[PDB]
Amino acid sequence: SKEIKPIENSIVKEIIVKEGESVRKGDVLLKLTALGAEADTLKTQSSLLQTRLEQTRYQILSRSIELNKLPELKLPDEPYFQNVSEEEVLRLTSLIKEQFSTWQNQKYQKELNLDKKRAERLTILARINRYENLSRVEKSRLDDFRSLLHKQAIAKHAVLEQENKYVEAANELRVYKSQLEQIESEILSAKEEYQLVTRLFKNEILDKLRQTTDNIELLTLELEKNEERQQASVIRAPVSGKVQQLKVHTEGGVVTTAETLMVIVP
Numbered sequence: 001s002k003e004i005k006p007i008e009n010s011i012v013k014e015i016i017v018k019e020g021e022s023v024r025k026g027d028v029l030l031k032l033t034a035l036g037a038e039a040d041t042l043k044t045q046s047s048l049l050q051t052r053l054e055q056t057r058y059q060i061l062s063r064s065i066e067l068n069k070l071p072e073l074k075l076p077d078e079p080y081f082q083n084v085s086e087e088e089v090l091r092l093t094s095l096i097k098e099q100f101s102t103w104q105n106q107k108y109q110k111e112l113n114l115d116k117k118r119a120e121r122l123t124i125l126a127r128i129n130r131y132e133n134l135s136r137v138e139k140s141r142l143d144d145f146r147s148l149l150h151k152q153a154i155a156k157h158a159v160l161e162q163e164n165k166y167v168e169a170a171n172e173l174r175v176y177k178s179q180l181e182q183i184e185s186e187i188l189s190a191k192e193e194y195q196l197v198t199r200l201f202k203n204e205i206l207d208k209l210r211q212t213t214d215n216i217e218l219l220t221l222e223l224e225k226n227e228e229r230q231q232a233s234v235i236r237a238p239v240s241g242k243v244q245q246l247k248v249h250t251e252g253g254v255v256t257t258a259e260t261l262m263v264i265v266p
């Protein structure tokens, strides 16, 4: 007495009723899935898996920053990590290893420069000490010399050459002191270069981790829509009675909203 049509163009997921079967109002007759829903959901799920792999990547790298060494490169076994291919895991671990290696090498280069500057500073300090001691010695010998001038116990020539020696010592000292100031400045700059590497690495990891979080959020919303559309529609008997004129026996075939799948009499 009443015709049964699908609310939307779909695929016959399950045929529960047979021809001539008696059903009550509310009994399930047919379950349908909307066309193209499973493929869409599959796509969204794939994207989710990828984004989560990336999330794992940047989490591991952040941890490696905190440890200055890589943690164990394994996926946690959570339900979103149930359909991961060997290729995806390999790609993940390779990416992690390569980024960590590059970071470490950059650090080591800047640290190398810094250490070179430190060694140079040590050398400069040694020279400064040397010529300060030399300067003072020549100055004292010269002072002893030049008032022997005023008691005419020494030649002017000896005085001139001692003054020459002292002057050279003092000039060398001044030069190396200036060099000390400059190298100290360069050491400061080198420290800032060394620190900048890890600073930027840490920042970039935080940024990417945030991005993956946002992406997981949006993809989750899209997945929610997909799951809402994909969930099987159930057709329940609007009245109790007999199933007649059933024109559906193939699971997996297409039915349209204009098609009468069966009638329930009366």
Ligand SMILES: [Zn+2]
Pocket (backbone or CB within 6 Å): 157, 161
């Ligand atoms: Zn001379």
